[PDB]
Ligand binder design. Structure first.
Ligand SMILES: Nc1ncnc2c1ncn2[C@@H]1O[C@H](COP(=O)(O)O)[C@@H](O)[C@H]1O
Ligand SMILES: [Ca+2]
Ligand SMILES: [Ca+2]
Ligand SMILES: [Ca+2]
Lengths: 748, 134
């Protein structure tokens, strides 16, 4: 064989908060300390307050006065919480409170009591199946605290409620939240983190990801002694010098001179820029070589460049060769001013010098190419390698030009949507994603640089590493600025990780958009244009699913299905097609309003006070199109939903699998005898495993069924009325799958 | 080594990924028996012990060939007969044909309408005979 595996192992650590800027903000040269509002302690204080308030509800005989769907929510929530509680005294306090609600529903609203008991015989956390629709938007837990708790909330409690007022889900303990979140993406789920309040509409996708991430442990990645970023290498050997002939010079691309060969591939001489240190060229050599050597190990699909040397060449010689060609002057300005320039020499197919947005590719080859690029980016991410400058994407608030943050809401204080992209098509003009696969491989970072205060994190994400300041955060009593945000210092690496996943897919989206605009600009055929933009939507959705597959192991077909529960592909195609072409620049206000209604289908239309440039659209500079107005959000609402959907499925699932194995470990200990316990709480621990399995995944359920049998052998003397229906459903499916595999072989 | 179906490889891939706790695309022997159990192929002591001797870590192509070897041991005849049995509440050996549509197409790797119609061929139809055909 050639062994397939990664040179990185992922674990956990105490905190990411090491060697970080002090948590302080300076205002009028006064130093204001930033304090973290603990997420878990505060969540729990509010569930205690919720339980007291139920207690007060009961004592008022006012059950009669709250609607039924709420009483269900309260009952089901209290059963689920009781099931999550290992302390018997608390478990018992919780069911005392449930029982009067149960007495009532049975007696006075019994179609509803019948709906409840169905969910109870499927699950130990039946609330998560109850909240798979519009019911999630009704905050039954905050509503009741508001009615029955007659004290001001604390500062901490108030801050928590401000941030997660959208759903009661945010108050759930870890295993119930994680399981709700994952099952929210399922085929029988119609939940959407969107709700209309008054005439206003509230989008809260980002908040699902923050609520989730604040529960996680600080991750840690260990690179092998053999990793590219670890193994000590010697100097590069350069025993060969390429003899440059102007006769074989195909053209000049950027600072790279391209020469033909007898073999119909290309020799590139990449020439040193002004202010570029020798080492930048060295690292591109060293990373091309590493990837060539480990290509088989990693299943790298790219057609890699082959390194040939790294050495110094006379400028007179570089000038004497280039002199004739077009671009000679631009190349002359681009390259360092020195008599001796460093070059990096390599060989590559022609397809390497083709940018992934090139309008000469037809859709089949573009798709094949995108798939290669996407594959290698996430496979390399698993290996510990990050590429932070695939494209030059920037934001601008008014002038501050800043690096684009794909999950901006998670990484700063009170920013609500993705910002306008400046000169968007230019940002990918020179993207390092090529027709062949990846390029510009030296411009790369060890994944560890995202989990520490590297020069990079301190530079691009210092709000996230420092803490949150805003005037509403300031206590006068403690003299501090308190926030949930300052708590991210401990988990900052987990945030940059997910950001990186969204950012790759953002570059792919911009590249696809550039290709679409270039291909459809001269098309005469309005249905044929629409076709291209529908297919670019399919490639984008598919890429997001490939990323799920590679990071989690969820089959791509299931991942694509999970995405489409949350992100709408009709809307994405409509929005991309409208805002990434200049055609809207010609519409009058009434036509523009009519077109906007179609691409957002009942959601609020994009609002802007900017004046459109004829033949361009939204454009600050009068010439290049932007995505968004001056100081406004990106209009690609669905893209935002899709990037958040993707990144929530990956983390959602890692974190679900963690909850599973913690339960498994508990079931194995009971089963073996390493924890003595009664029958009924063995059955309970097993039923719980069912809930923590990935949605749409059979093989977990099968293992639990096996655990179940094992348990019934151990405690045969004990009824199984509460658990038989769910296990029988798992058993019927396990049996049906074998019959299906049998029939498939027969057809052959 | 492996004449496996697209569907088996999809399943064994996800299972491998799940029990690869550190994401390096290799599982330890610690996990092997538990992962094997999850795929219907719970091993004997000796078979698990023999697999443990063979070794630290196991990549995913090595896994796709451990699984085929254990799969050879399985009698199709018995493993399919014990499945159909679940749908036989009684000892009659009889199931319903109107039904078996609503099983094959509503559970597991669901059959297509053509596949369901194609199966009903080979009032009622008994299972014990159907295995004898294949
Ligand atoms: N670095 C960034 N990357 C992406 N979007 C941003 C960034 N900074 C601000 N935004 C968003 O862009 C819009 C206008 O910028 P601002 O006025 O800074 O909020 C807002 O809707 C912000 O949420
Ligand atoms: Ca480049
Ligand atoms: Ca570069
Ligand atoms: Ca491992």
């Amino acid at each position: 064989h050639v062994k397939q595996y990664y040179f990185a192992r992922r674990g956990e650590t105490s905190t990411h908060d090491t060697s970080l800027p002090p948590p302080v903000k300076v205002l009028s040269g006064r130093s204001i300390p930033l304090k973290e509002i603990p997420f878990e302690a505060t969540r729990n204080e509010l569930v205690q307050i919720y339980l007291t308030s139920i207690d007060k509800l009961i004592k008022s005989n006012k059950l009669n006065s709250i609607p039924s769907q709420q009483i269900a929510s309260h009952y089901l929530f209290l059963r689920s919480l009781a099931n999550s509680e290992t302390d018997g005294i608390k478990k018992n306090q919780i069911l005392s409170l449930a029982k009067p609600l149960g007495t009532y529903l049975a007696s006075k609203e019994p179609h509803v009591w019948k709906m409840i008991n169905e969910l109870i015989e499927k699950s130990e956390y039946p609330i998560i199946h109850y909240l798979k629709n519009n019911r999630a938007h009704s905050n039954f837990m905050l509503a009741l605290i508001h009615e029955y708790h007659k004290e001001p909330l604390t500062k901490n409690q108030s801050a928590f409620v401000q941030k997660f007022r959208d759903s009661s889900v945010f108050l759930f303990p870890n295993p119930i939240y994680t399981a709700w979140l994952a099952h929210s993406y399922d085929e029988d789920s119609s939940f959407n983190p969107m709700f209309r309040e008054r005439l206003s509409t509230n989008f809260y996708h980002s908040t699902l990801t923050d609520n989730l991430l604040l529960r996680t442990e600080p991750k840690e990645v260990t690179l092998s002694s053999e990793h590219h970023y670890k193994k000590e290498k010697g100097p590069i050997d350069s025993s060969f010098r390429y003899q440059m002939s102007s006769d074989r010079l195909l053209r000049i691309q950027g600072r790279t001179l391209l020469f033909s060969t007898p073999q119909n591939d290309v020799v590139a001489v990449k020439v040193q820029k002004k202010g570029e240190p020798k080492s930048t060229l060295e690292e591109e050599f060293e990373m091309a070589d590493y990837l060539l050597k480990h290509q088989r190990r990693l299943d790298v699909h790219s057609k890699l460049p082959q390194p040939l040397g790294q050495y110094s060449v006379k400028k007179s010689e570089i000038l004497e060769i280039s002199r004739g060609s077009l671009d000679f002057e631009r190349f002359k300005t681009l390259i360092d001013d020195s008599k001796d320039l460093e070059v990096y020499v390599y060989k590559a197919p022609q397809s390497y010098f083709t940018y992934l947005h090139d309008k000469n590719q037809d859709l089949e080859d573009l798709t094949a190419s995108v798939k290669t690029n996407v594959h290698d980016l996430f496979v390399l991410l698993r290996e510990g390698i990050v590429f932070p400058q695939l494209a030059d994407i920037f934001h601008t608030h008014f002038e501050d030009k800043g690096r684009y943050q794909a999950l901006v809401q998670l990484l700063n204080v009170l920013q609500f949507q993705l910002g306008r992209i400046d000169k968007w098509q230019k940002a990918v003009e020179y993207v390092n994603l090529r027709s062949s696969g990846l390029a510009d491989l030296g411009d790369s970072l060890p994944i560890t640089s995202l989990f520490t205060s590297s020069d990079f994190t301190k530079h691009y994400f210092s709000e996230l590493l420092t803490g949150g300041y805003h005037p509403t955060f300031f206590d006068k009593s403690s003299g501090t600025a308190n926030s949930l945000f300052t708590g991210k210092r401990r988990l900052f690496g987990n945030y940059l990780y997910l950001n990186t996943i969204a950012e790759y897919l953002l570059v792919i989206q911009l590249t696809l958009g550039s290709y679409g605009d270039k291909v459809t600009r001269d098309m005469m055929d309005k249905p044929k244009k629409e076709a291209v933009w529908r297919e670019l939507a399919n490639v984008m959705f598919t890429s997001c699913a490939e990323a799920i597959h590679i990071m989690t192991g969820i089959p791509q077909s299931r991942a694509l299905t999970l995405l489409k529960q949350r992100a709408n592909i009709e809307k994405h195609f409509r929005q991309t097609q409208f805002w990434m072409t200049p055609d809207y620049s010609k519409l009058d206000e009434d036509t523009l309003q009519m077109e906007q209604y179609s691409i957002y289908s009942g959601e609020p239309e994009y609002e802007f006070t900017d004046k459109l440039v004829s033949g361009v659209g939204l454009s600050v500079d009068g010439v290049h199109q932007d995505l968004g107005g001056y100081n406004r959000e990106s209009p690609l609402r669905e893209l935002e939903k899709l990037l958040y959907a993707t990144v929530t499925l990956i983390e959602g699932t890692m974190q679900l699998d963690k909850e599973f194995f913690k339960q498994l470990e508990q079931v194995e200990k009971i089963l073996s005898g390493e924890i003595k316990t009664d029958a009924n709480s063995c059955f309970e621990a097993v039923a719980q495993l069912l809930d923590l399995a990935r949605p749409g995944c059979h093989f977990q359920k099968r293992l639990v069924l096996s655990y179940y049998e094992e348990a019934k052998l151990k405690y045969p003397s004990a009824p199984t009325d509460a658990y038989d229906s769910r296990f029988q459903v798992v058993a019927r499916t396990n049996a049906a799958i074998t019959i299906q595999r049998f029939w498939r072989e027969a057809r052959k | 080594a492996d004449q496996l179906t697209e569907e088996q490889i999809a399943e064994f891939k996800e299972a491998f990924s799940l029990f690869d706790k550190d994401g390096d695309g290799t599982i330890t022997t610690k996990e092997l028996g538990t992962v094997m159990r999850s795929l219907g192929q719970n091993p004997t002591e000796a078979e698990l012990q023999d697999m443990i001797n063979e070794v630290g870590t196991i990549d995913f192509p090595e896994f796709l060939t451990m699984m085929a070897r254990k799969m050879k041991d399985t009698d199709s005849e018995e493993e399919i007969a014990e499945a159909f049995r679940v749908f036989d509440k009684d000892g009659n050996g009889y199931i319903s044909a109107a039904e078996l549509r609503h099983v094959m197409t509503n559970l597991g790797e669901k059959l297509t309408d053509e596949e369901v119609d194609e199966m009903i061929r080979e009032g009622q139809v008994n299972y014990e005979e159907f295995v004898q055909m294949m």
